[PDB]
């Protein structure tokens, strides 16, 4: 030191440095703490977890993306696993709990190789080559279901729906949830069975009632009620009609005023009396343009003054006030209407058409909500969920949201696999077979990747109270005797380890990302040597 303070970087004593074997041991144990948390919630026998927010709100979910999102951490290695499950939920939306277990399994097998003197890059080079050998092997085993007609294509959507609905709370209703999740895509989809638009399906939760009241409603569900509720709640169309002629207006009902700040100077009583007549002439003109167009229900973004409450009541025109701008886009899609900027552009061709407009009483008081139904197949499907608890209404949203993420992935052509641990076992023996042919220094790299794939089937046996040794040995001996890859772990214990008889189906695009996200993330973690963490 020579007697003078030696400071290279500001906040010297605040920041710490980790290097050597101690830096690698801290990174592996950081993933083991996250893995053992996620391994308990993996599989249909898993368990949820309570998430306490700093504001007092609680969240109960088993989803690895939601648990880690609200989780407050310290070590940066555990924070990298947070965005790992976030990467899985944002794109594919399925298998968020599997990418955390598989990534930590790669790190657990890598720690044993580091202690043997293997360079970390040589470990990462072996996982990259072994990842492409597992994907290419499973790609040859799967078959294309696109040859079936639309009648059988709906069955495959019901198969993968019931699988994603498991492992989560309120899993007893999955039979009806699987039916409602597929019908949303049947109504909203392209004629070529490709590139379906997910944004056309909205998730609207409601707190009350019971879960058995959840049903599909095609239309718009708004939180605003009819203005001046002297009008009937349920609106009915005319005897003969083309429709209800729903009107959408982004302009409030007011006398015309300049957008710029203006000054209207009245220099005489005669000029003031003309403003009185000019005032009432506009409210009479605005209500006549709607009646001449045949419209019935008028939707306003900014609302309107109390003057038009009785005016629209005389003509029997329902009206709503203070509708959000985002909801106006949702309204024009369901009724296939066009937003009318002003009364001068109002025409009968821009009016929307829906089957019925009505409101429900829901509970005792609560609030008044408007419901729109469609008379035929449309481009708008709104999910309606009820529950006796605020936590049930919340989790059921993302429970069906992840279920819709599985169905939209099946819209992509010629990608299907069977779940239940049958995919990881098939890809595990293919990597271990190449290790004997290659040998060399990378022979131990394929072994670590093969032992990591078997952790997912062994984790399924832990939550089901089984023997991971006896279950894994049966799956490996079955793939060697016969080429059928459909044998997997059964956590429901209905027998018939064949996945074909149990109908369990998973998207291949979801399972392919699990290997890519786990292998490519461990490649960056193993390269970390000096760890500089500043004090908070």
């Amino acid at each position: 030191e020579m007697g003078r303070p030696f400071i290279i970087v500001k906040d010297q004593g605040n920041k710490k440095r980790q290097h050597g074997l101690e830096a690698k041991k801290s990174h592996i144990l950081a993933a083991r703490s996250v893995a053992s948390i996620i391994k308990t919630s993996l599989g249909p026998r898993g368990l949820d977890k309570i998430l306490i927010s700093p504001d007092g709100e609680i969240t109960i979910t088993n989803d690895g993306a939601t648990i880690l999102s609200q989780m407050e951490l310290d070590n940066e290695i555990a924070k990298l696993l947070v965005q790992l499950s976030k990467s899985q939920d944002d794109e594919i939306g399925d298998g968020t709990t599997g990418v955390v277990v598989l990534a930590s399994a790669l790190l657990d097998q890598a720690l044993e190789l580091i202690q043997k003197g293997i360079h970390p890059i040589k470990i990462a080079n072996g996982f990259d080559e072994a990842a492409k050998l597992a994907i290419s092997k499973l790609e040859e085993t799967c078959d294309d279901i696109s040859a079936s007609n639309d009648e059988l294509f709906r069955d495959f959507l019901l198969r993968a729906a019931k699988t994603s609905l498991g492992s989560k709370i309120v899993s007893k209703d999955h039979d009806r949830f699987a039916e409602m999740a597929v019908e949303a895509v049947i109504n909203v989809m392209d004629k070529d069975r490709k590139d379906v638009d997910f944004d056309l399906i909205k998730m609207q939760g409601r707190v009350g009632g019971s879960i058995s009241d959840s049903k599909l409603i095609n239309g718009v569900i708004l939180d605003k009620d009819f203005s001046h509720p002297q009008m009937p709640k349920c609106v009915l169309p005319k005897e003969g009609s083309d429709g209800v002629k729903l009107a959408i207006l982004t302009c409030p009902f007011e006398p015309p005023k300049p957008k710029t700040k203006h000054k209207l100077d009245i220099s005489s009583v005669e000029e003031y009396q003309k403003l009185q007549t000019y005032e009432q002439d506009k409210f009479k003109e605005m209500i006549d343009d709607v009646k001449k167009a045949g419209a019935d229900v008028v939707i306003c973004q900014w609302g309107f003054d109390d003057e038009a409450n009785h005016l629209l009541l005389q003509n029997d025109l329902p009206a709503v006030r203070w509708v959000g701008g985002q909801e106006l886009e949702h309204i024009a899609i369901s009724t296939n209407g066009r937003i009318v900027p002003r009364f001068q552009d109002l025409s009968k061709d821009k009016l929307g058409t829906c089957s019925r407009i009505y409101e429900q009483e829901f509970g005792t008081t609560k609030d008044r909500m408007l419901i729109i139904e469609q008379s035929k197949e449309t481009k708008t499907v709104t999910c309606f969920v009820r529950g006796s608890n605020k936590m049930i209404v919340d989790e059921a949203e993302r429970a069906l949201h992840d279920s819709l993420c599985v169905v939209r992935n099946l819209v992509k052509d010629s990608r299907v696999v069977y779940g239940g641990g049958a995919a990881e076992v098939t890809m595990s023996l293919a990597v271990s077979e190449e290790a004997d042919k290659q040998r060399g220094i990378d022979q131990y790299a394929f072994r670590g990747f093969a032992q990591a794939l078997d952790t997912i089937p062994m984790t399924l046996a832990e939550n089901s109270g089984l023997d991971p040794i006896g279950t894994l040995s049966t799956l490996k001996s079955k793939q060697l005797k016969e080429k059928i890859s459909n044998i997997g772990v059964d956590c429901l214990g209905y027998g018939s380890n064949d996945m074909k008889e149990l109908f369990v189906v998973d998207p291949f695009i979801g399972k392919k990302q699990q290997i890519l996200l786990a292998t490519q993330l461990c490649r960056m973690i193993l390269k970390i040597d000096n760890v500089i963490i500043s004090g908070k």
């Binding site: 944002d90 794109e91 300049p258 203006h262 209207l264 886009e329 066009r338 937003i339 000096n530």
Partner: protein, 344 residues
């Protein structure tokens, strides 16, 4: 090296320039290694780690010389004379290589950094990236790359033009078609919405009869700029200034795409991609100033929808869409791609 600053911002970098930017060096002599790391990264972009290692070794070998009776200037005479013969030696190492006509040099630049093992893929995009830039220009913005959190880095693909984020949701957006067979892109600096026009707003109206004409005049002036765009057949309209829902809904019935909020750096790539021009007024719009491409399709990437410009016969814009699990993964790939393009 994993470095966390006082703001708890995680960054993983092996680059000699990026590591020294994260840490704040208060030592006067230690800041000289930061200048040579940023100077090496600015021009060539590669070797910033080797320069700091080499510069520090020259001081380490001069350490036992300072303890002796060797003067300070006598040591600098050795380094200044040896570097003169070292530069001339590099010219002997190099070869004219006018024969053989990017592929090899781009693979070695990715070394020591992520995706280096993926060089069988990302290098193919690095070759065609700079080739779209003509000689004597070689714009650093047109090679710009956008980062999308989430996904796998192997799912990236090459695009002939710029792709930008919407950043705003329009009420009339879905009513606009997302698939164009022959789109015409029109760059405009005009601001389309109902607002005060230029820098001041005041209105003086004595009579109520003339008060109605003032409102109708404001609607006609805003619609006049909207009609001139439709008469030219522009399918896509881009603007820096905000665009209200009034102009967006008008373009919905005409099947015309509308966009706004786009940054100034992104629209500079649009002019080079489609070969168009910037029009700051709607009265000067002419048919020959509108660009086009082969097709226009809006694809959603990681819960984010982007506008895809591709298929133009001549385009100088290169924009890549990167994916990765960690927020640093998408940063490290572009950090490797940005350094690999400067080599070629």
């Amino acid at each position: 090296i994993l470095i966390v600053t006082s703001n708890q911002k995680t960054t993983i970098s092996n680059d000699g320039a990026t590591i020294l930017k994260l840490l704040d060096v208060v030592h006067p002599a230690a800041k000289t290694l930061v200048d040579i790391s940023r100077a090496q990264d600015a021009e060539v972009g590669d070797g910033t780690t080797s320069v700091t290692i080499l510069a520090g070794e020259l001081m380490k070998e001069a350490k036992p010389f300072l303890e002796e009776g060797i003067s300070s200037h006598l040591i600098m005479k050795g380094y200044r004379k040896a570097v003169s013969l070292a530069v001339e030696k590099i010219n002997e190492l190099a070869v004219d290589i006018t024969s053989e006509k990017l592929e090899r040099c781009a693979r070695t630049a990715m070394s020591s950094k992520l995706i280096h093992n993926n060089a069988d893929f990302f290098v193919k995009m690095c070759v065609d990236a700079v080739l779209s830039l003509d000689r004597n220009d070689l714009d650093d913005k047109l090679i710009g790359i956008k980062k999308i959190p989430g996904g796998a880095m192997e799912e990236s693909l090459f695009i002939n033009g710029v792709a930008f984020k919407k950043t705003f949701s329009y009420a009339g957006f879905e009513q606009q078609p997302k698939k164009f067979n022959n789109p015409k892109i029109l760059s405009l600096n005009v601001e389309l919405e109902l607002k005060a026009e230029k820098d001041n707003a005041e209105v003086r109206v004595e009579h109520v009869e003339d008060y109605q004409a003032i409102v109708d005049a404001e609607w006609q002036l805003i619609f006049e700029k909207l009609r001139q765009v439709e008469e030219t057949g522009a399918n896509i309209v881009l603007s820096k200034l905000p665009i209200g829902d009034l102009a967006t809904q008008f373009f919905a019935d005409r099947n015309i795409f509308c966009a706004g909020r786009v940054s100034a750096d992104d629209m500079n790539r649009v002019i080079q991609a489609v070969g168009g021009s910037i029009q700051s007024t709607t009265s000067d719009i002419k048919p020959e100033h509108l660009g086009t491409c082969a097709l226009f399709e809006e694809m959603q990437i990681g819960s984010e929808r982007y506008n895809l410009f591709q298929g133009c016969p001549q385009a100088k814009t290169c924009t890549l869409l990167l994916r990765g699990g960690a927020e640093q993964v998408i940063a490290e790939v572009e950090r490797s791609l940005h350094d690999a393009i400067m080599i070629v």
